[PDB]
Design a protein around this ligand. Structure first.
Ligand SMILES: *[C@@H]1O[C@H](CO)[C@@H](O[C@@H]2O[C@H](CO)[C@@H](O[C@@H]3O[C@H](CO[C@H]4O[C@H](CO)[C@@H](O)[C@H](O)[C@@H]4O)[C@@H](O)[C@H](O[C@H]4O[C@H](CO)[C@@H](O)[C@H](O)[C@@H]4O)[C@@H]3O)[C@H](O)[C@H]2NC(C)=O)[C@H](O)[C@H]1NC(C)=O
Ligand SMILES: *[C@@H]1O[C@H](CO)[C@@H](O[C@@H]2O[C@H](CO)[C@@H](O)[C@H](O)[C@H]2NC(C)=O)[C@H](O)[C@H]1NC(C)=O
Ligand SMILES: *[C@@H]1O[C@H](CO)[C@@H](O[C@@H]2O[C@H](CO)[C@@H](O)[C@H](O)[C@H]2NC(C)=O)[C@H](O)[C@H]1NC(C)=O
Ligand SMILES: *[C@@H]1O[C@H](CO)[C@@H](O)[C@H](O)[C@H]1NC(C)=O
Ligand SMILES: *[C@@H]1O[C@H](CO)[C@@H](O)[C@H](O)[C@H]1NC(C)=O
Ligand SMILES: *[C@@H]1O[C@H](CO)[C@@H](O)[C@H](O)[C@H]1NC(C)=O
Ligand SMILES: *[C@@H]1O[C@H](CO)[C@@H](O)[C@H](O)[C@H]1NC(C)=O
Length: 268
C-alpha cells in the first residue's frame, strides 16, 4: 500500500500483471540531456566542473508507469514499483497524446515523493492536467491504492489518490505550464541538506529549475501512480504510458556552455 486510507474496495485484485521494464535506451549526457541549468545562474561561453545530483552515464531506466482499465492490483503498490528515493531521480516521461474528435489531450503518470505517505508527513505530488503541471506538497491523506485517470477519454473509476475533505496543510502549491505537443518531458527530483529540488524540461534539453522546498526531513520513497483509462491500449488506440526513471547520485560533471548560455555538452 502507499498511504493507509481506505479510499476504495471497488475492483481490487492481487494479479501479477507486469514488472518494471528496463530501457534499451541509456543515459547519454554528451548533449546536456540528464543535466540541469544551475539554479538561477547564467554561465556564458565556458566549461565548468560542477558537482550536482546527476544520473550515471550509460545507466538504464525502469518504466514505472502502470496503465489500468477497471482493476487495480495490490502488487502495484509494493516494491519494485514503490521505490527508495535515496539522493533523487532523473525521469524521462512520455507525453501520451490522445485525440477527442480532432482535439489534442496530454496525459502522463502522476509521481508522488514522500516517506510514509500519512497526513502527519509531507507528500510532494507532481500531476499533469493537459498542459498544466500541478505541483504540491501538502500533508495528504494518501489512499492505500492511489491512482489517476484519463480525464480526456474517461475511466470506469473515479480519480482517487488522497482523501482530504477539508484542505490539508501545504508547504508548496504552484502550477507550471508545459507544451502539450511534446513527445518527452524530463525531470530531476533530488534532496540535499534537508531541501528538496525540482527541475523540468519539455523538449530533450537540460532541465530548468521548477522550485525548491525546505523539509529538513529526508524523503525516503517515491511512487509513480497508476493511471486508469478506457483508452491507451492496443484494442483502442495503440497508445502507451511511459515513465522512465534512473537514480541520481552526487557526481562531478563537466558542463559546456555556449555564448547564449545553453549547455551544449556534458561529461560524467
Ligand atoms: C489523517 O489520516 C488518518 C489515517 O489514514 C485518518 O484517520 C482514519 O480516518 C478514517 C475515517 O474516519 C477512520 O475510519 C473509521 O474508523 C472508525 C473506528 O474504527 C473502529 O473499528 C476498528 C475495527 O478494526 C477498530 O480497530 C477501532 O478501534 C474502532 O473500534 C469506524 O467507526 C468508522 O466506520 C465507518 O466506516 C466503515 C468503513 O470503513 C463502515 O463499515 C462503518 O459503518 C462506518 O460508516 C471508519 O472505519 C480510520 O480508523 C482512521 N485511522 C486511524 C489510524 O486513526 C485521519 O482521518 C486523517 N486526518 C485528517 C485531518 O484528514
Ligand atoms: C474498505 O472500505 C470499504 C467501503 O466502506 C469496506 O467495504 C464494506 O465492508 C463491510 C464489512 O464487510 C460491508 O458490510 C459493506 O457492504 C462494504 N461496502 C462496500 C461498498 O463494499 C471494506 O471492508 C474496507 N476494507 C478494509 C480492509 O478496510
Ligand atoms: C492549478 O491547476 C489546477 C488544474 O487546472 C487548478 O485546479 C482547478 O481549480 C478550479 C478552481 O479552484 C476548480 O474548479 C477545478 O475543479 C480544479 N481542477 C482540478 C483538476 O482540480 C488549480 O486551481 C490551479 N491553481 C493553483 C494555484 O494551484
Ligand atoms: C511477477 O512475475 C514475474 C515473471 O514471472 C516474476 O519475475 C516476479 O518475481 C513476479 N512478482 C511477484 C510479486 O510475484
Ligand atoms: C568564446 O570563447 C572562446 C575561447 O576563449 C573565444 O575564442 C571566443 O572569442 C569566445 N566567443 C565569444 C562570442 O565570446
Ligand atoms: C511544442 O512541441 C512540438 C514537438 O516537440 C514542437 O514542434 C513545437 O515547436 C513546440 N512548441 C512550443 C511552443 O514549444
Ligand atoms: C494495434 O496494432 C496491432 C498491430 O499492428 C493491430 O493488429 C491492431 O489492429 C491495432 N489497433 C488499433 C486500434 O490501431
Amino acid at each position: 500500500v502507499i498511504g493507509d486510507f481506505n479510499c476504495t474496495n471497488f475492483a481490487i485484485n492481487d494479479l501479477n500483471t507486469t514488472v518494471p521494464r528496463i530501457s534499451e535506451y541509456v543515459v547519454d549526457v554528451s548533449y546536456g540531456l540528464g543535466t540541469y541549468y544551475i539554479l538561477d545562474r547564467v554561465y556564458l561561453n565556458t566549461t565548468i566542473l560542477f558537482t550536482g545530483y546527476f544520473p550515471k552515464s550509460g545507466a538504464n531506466f525502469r518504466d514505472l508507469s502502470l496503465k489500468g482499465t477497471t482493476y487495480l492490483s495490490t502488487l502495484w503498490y509494493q516494491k519494485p514499483f514503490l521505490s527508495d528515493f535515496n539522493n533523487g531521480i532523473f525521469s524521462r516521461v512520455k507525453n501520451t497524446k490522445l485525440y477527442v474528435n480532432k482535439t489534442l489531450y496530454s496525459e502522463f503518470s502522476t509521481i508522488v515523493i514522500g516517506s510514509v505517505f500519512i497526513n502527519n508527513s509531507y507528500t510532494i505530488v507532481v500531476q499533469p492536467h493537459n498542459g498544466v503541471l500541478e505541483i504540491t506538497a501538502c500533508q495528504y491523506t494518501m489512499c492505500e491504492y492511489p491512482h489517476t485517470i484519463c480525464k480526456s477519454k474517461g475511466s470506469s473509476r473515479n480519480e482517487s489518490w488522497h482523501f482530504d475533505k477539508s484542505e490539508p496543510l501545504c508547504l508548496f502549491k504552484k502550477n507550471f505550464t508545459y507544451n502539450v505537443s511534446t513527445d518527452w518531458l524530463y525531470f530531476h527530483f533530488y534532496q540535499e541538506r534537508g531541501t528538496f529540488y525540482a527541475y523540468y524540461a519539455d523538449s530533450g534539453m537540460p532541465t530548468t529549475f521548477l522550485f525548491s522546498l525546505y523539509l529538513g526531513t529526508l524523503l525516503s520513497h517515491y511512487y509513480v501512480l497508476p493511471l486508469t483509462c478506457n483508452a491507451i491500449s492496443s484494442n483502442t488506440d495503440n497508445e502507451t504510458l511511459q515513465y522512465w526513471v534512473t537514480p541520481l547520485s552526487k557526481r562531478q560533471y563537466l558542463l559546456k556552455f555556449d555564448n547564449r548560455g545553453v549547455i551544449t555538452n556534458a561529461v560524467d
